[PDB]
Amino acid sequence: SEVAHRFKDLGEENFKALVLIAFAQYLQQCPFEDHVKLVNEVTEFAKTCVADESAENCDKSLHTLFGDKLCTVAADCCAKQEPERNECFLQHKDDNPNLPRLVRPEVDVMCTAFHDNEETFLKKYLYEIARRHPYFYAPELLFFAKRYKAAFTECCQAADKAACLLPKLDELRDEGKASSAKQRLKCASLQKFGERAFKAWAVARLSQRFPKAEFAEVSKLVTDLTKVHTECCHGDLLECADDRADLAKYICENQDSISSKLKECCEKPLLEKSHCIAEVENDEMPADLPSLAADFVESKDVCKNYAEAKDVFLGMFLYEYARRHPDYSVVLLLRLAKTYETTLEKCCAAADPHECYAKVFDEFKPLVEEPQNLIKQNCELFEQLGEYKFQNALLVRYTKKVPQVSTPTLVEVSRNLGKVGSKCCKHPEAKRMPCAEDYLSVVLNQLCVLHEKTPVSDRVTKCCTESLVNRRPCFSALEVDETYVPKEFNAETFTFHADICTLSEKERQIKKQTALVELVKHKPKATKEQLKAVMDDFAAFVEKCCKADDKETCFAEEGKKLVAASQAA
Ligand SMILES: O=C(O)c1cc(-c2ccc(F)cc2F)ccc1O
Ligand SMILES: O=C(O)c1cc(-c2ccc(F)cc2F)ccc1O
Ligand SMILES: O=C(O)c1cc(-c2ccc(F)cc2F)ccc1O
Numbered sequence: 001s002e003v004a005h006r007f008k009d010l011g012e013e014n015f016k017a018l019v020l021i022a023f024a025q026y027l028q029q030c031p032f033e034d035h036v037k038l039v040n041e042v043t044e045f046a047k048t049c050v051a052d053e054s055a056e057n058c059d060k061s062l063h064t065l066f067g068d069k070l071c072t073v074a075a076d077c078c079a080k081q082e083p084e085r086n087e088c089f090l091q092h093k094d095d096n097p098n099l100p101r102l103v104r105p106e107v108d109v110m111c112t113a114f115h116d117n118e119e120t121f122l123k124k125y126l127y128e129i130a131r132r133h134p135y136f137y138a139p140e141l142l143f144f145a146k147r148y149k150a151a152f153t154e155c156c157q158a159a160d161k162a163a164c165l166l167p168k169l170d171e172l173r174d175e176g177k178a179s180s181a182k183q184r185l186k187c188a189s190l191q192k193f194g195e196r197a198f199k200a201w202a203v204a205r206l207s208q209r210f211p212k213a214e215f216a217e218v219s220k221l222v223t224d225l226t227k228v229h230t231e232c233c234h235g236d237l238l239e240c241a242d243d244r245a246d247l248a249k250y251i252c253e254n255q256d257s258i259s260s261k262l263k264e265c266c267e268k269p270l271l272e273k274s275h276c277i278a279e280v281e282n283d284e285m286p287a288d289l290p291s292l293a294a295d296f297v298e299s300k301d302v303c304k305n306y307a308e309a310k311d312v313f314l315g316m317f318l319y320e321y322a323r324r325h326p327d328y329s330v331v332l333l334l335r336l337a338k339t340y341e342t343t344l345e346k347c348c349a350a351a352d353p354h355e356c357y358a359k360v361f362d363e364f365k366p367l368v369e370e371p372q373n374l375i376k377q378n379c380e381l382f383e384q385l386g387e388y389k390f391q392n393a394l395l396v397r398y399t400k401k402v403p404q405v406s407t408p409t410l411v412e413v414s415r416n417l418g419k420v421g422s423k424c425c426k427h428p429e430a431k432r433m434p435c436a437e438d439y440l441s442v443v444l445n446q447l448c449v450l451h452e453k454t455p456v457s458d459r460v461t462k463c464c465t466e467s468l469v470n471r472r473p474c475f476s477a478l479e480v481d482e483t484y485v486p487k488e489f490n491a492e493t494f495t496f497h498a499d500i501c502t503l504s505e506k507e508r509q510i511k512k513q514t515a516l517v518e519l520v521k522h523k524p525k526a527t528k529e530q531l532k533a534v535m536d537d538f539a540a541f542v543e544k545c546c547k548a549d550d551k552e553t554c555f556a557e558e559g560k561k562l563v564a565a566s567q568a569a
């Protein structure tokens with residue numbers, strides 16, 4: 001009995017949660033009520049199995065069981081067999097579910113709902129997040145849950161809860177968003193590019209954090225980790241949670257053979273342990289390390305070893321280069337690595353392999369410098385323009401590159417693109433390029449998935465599917481789409497009403513930024529000079545109409561003077 005197996009291992013609490021999560025992630029439209037129902041029905045069935053490990057259908061796989069229970073409330077999909085059925089659900093997850101924004105009631109009401117019924121208050125939190133982020137890292141979600149719990153438990157019995165809770169709740173919303181992004185990138189790697197891509201990443205990333213670990217150790221960690229994520233991304237939430245626990249055990253037992261910063265971590269609760277380990281800082285770089293050139297370019301056995309076990313060889317390359325380079329970003333390392341592989345591929349087929357791959361490290365020089373330059377700049381522009389204007393600039397810029405992309409997606413992706421600026425540009429010259437180029441891969445992945453749903457720009461497709469590591473470089477190359485046919489103006493699209501006045505300070509910027517998009521889609525060839533100039537008139541008018549007697553009509557009148565002056569420029 002599989003269900004029985006996992007249950008013992010996870011216990012009722014987590015098992016219950018994981019299953020709630022898996023359901024909210026497969027049927028994001030269904031109400032809370034119905035999920036909760038099915039979860040209980042399933043949980044009790046599991047109980048009967050622990051005992052009689054041969055009762056009803058304790059023999060069946062998780063999918064069959066989970067699938068049949070969802071099929072009692074959903075159709076094509078359910079009209080299928082396994083694994084076909086299961087794959088169906090996976091393909092129908094919505095990365096942008098049409099769901100109501102989530103508004104939080106006043107502090108008082110929350111604390112009351114929390115104190116009265118705690119389990120419910122938390123089960124609904126898990127539900128509202130699982131359904132919106134169908135790819136959120138299950139295990140990690142439970143961790144956020146606890147942290148969420150501790151938030152209320154502590155703030156609801158203080159002097160000023162509003163002052164105690166609201167902050168901790170924001171810090172969580174953000175970090176929870178950052179978390180979802182990363183895990184999304186992760187699933188994307190595996191699903192669109194295969195495990196070979198995910199592994200390479202893992203090797204480089206781990207090697208950077210565990211410099212003292214042995215290649216053979218890393219590979220093992222890498223092999224396990226993959227399986228963990230390969231499962232979660234595929235919806236095998238229970239086993240993913242199980243295996244992820246194992247891994248945390250193993251790492252803790254073999255501490256000395258891996259890293260010396262893993263002490264603090266292994267001395268705490270399961271959920272807090274895994275979270276801790278996953279975010280441990282890089283161990284101190286081993287002192288006397290030979291030169292890479294030695295075993296990787298000077299040696300004359302290069303092509304021999306490469307042909308023997310191509311992957312392990314490259315796998316070693318990576319591990320070697322990475323471990324002594326925590327100042328490099330995982331993608332950059334991956335590029336270099338990919339460059340090396342290409343060199344060996346063409347060189348090992350030459351008369352004198354050695355001469356050919358002799359200067360491969362000269363090839364690297366350009367690659368390391370480009371990212372460096374780009375950031376040095378844009379962060380020099382961030383320090384100047386400020387966050388908002390900086391997002392605007394990026395807005396103009398990306399719209400010009402891929403005009404087809406839907407206004408909403410562009411606005412979103414660009415706002416995020418601009419946060420990277422606030423996040424990375426504060427660090428020192430040295431720490432700038434990593435932060436930025438790795439974050440950019442998370443964000444740009446956002447653009448890629450949202451777009452994959454309803455493709456409209458071949459230029460976006462190519463850049464997203466050609467190479468995972470090269471994405472940022474691909475998009476940066478694009479300038480303006482010369483074949484784009486400019487859009488014709490729509491009255492409705494540029495009509496500002498008074499309802500924008502009630503909207504928060506940000507929701508406004510969001511409006512103005514959505515306007516700027518439409519403008520550019522209308523005037524591709526327009527210039528940054530004109531655009532700024534025009535943006536000024538608008539600002540000058542929201543203030544007017546919004547504070548001018550009983551006028552829901554100044555929106556039609558003041559807006560007329562707007563479009564008029566707008567059609568002119
Ligand atoms: O589930 C996870 O996200 C996870 C992550 C790690 C991990 C540890 C250290 C590191 F630099 C990267 C990691 F992914 C190790 C084990 C693990 O289960
Ligand atoms: O073409 C570009 O100039 C460009 C720039 C960025 C970018 C965003 C935020 C930042 F702080 C630095 C950047 F380089 C991200 C993507 C991109 O295409
Ligand atoms: O899209 C990509 O950039 C990509 C990259 C790799 C890869 C191969 C070898 C290597 F040393 C590092 C890599 F990232 C493997 C698969 C892949 O799709």
